[PDB]
Design a binder for this molecule. Sequence first.
Ligand code: BEF
Ligand SMILES: [Mg+2]
Ligand SMILES: [Mn+2]
Length: 130
Amino acid sequence: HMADKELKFLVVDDFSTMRRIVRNLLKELGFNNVEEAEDGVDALNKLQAGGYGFVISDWDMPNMDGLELLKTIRADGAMSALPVLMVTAKAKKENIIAAAQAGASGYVVKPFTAATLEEKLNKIFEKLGM
Ligand code: BEF
Ligand SMILES: [Mg+2]
Ligand SMILES: [Mn+2]
């Protein structure tokens, strides 16, 4: 998948406010192909419906948290390389390590600026040749 207008994003957070912020930013960056999920399970359901090229995900969520979601994705042969960008209020160095070691593509701390999200996405795009 390439970082073109068609790239399909899944945006995961248990609060719609954050989802709404991320969706509108993506639109601004020229990405209109964006779905939402409210937790890890909901997320995996949409993901298995196929088509997704990028995940942006919260951490603290009920049912299945973002760290578990990330690990599940990384451990599934069909989606093991799916980019996952964590966007979360968890800022302890030990949260960052756990997510990084689990295979996070990137990590943004809430609250964040439009500029930060764009810079972090582009950083991942470059890294993956998208
Ligand atoms: F709830 Be998330 F981790 F911001
Ligand atoms: Mg539902
Ligand atoms: Mn949350």
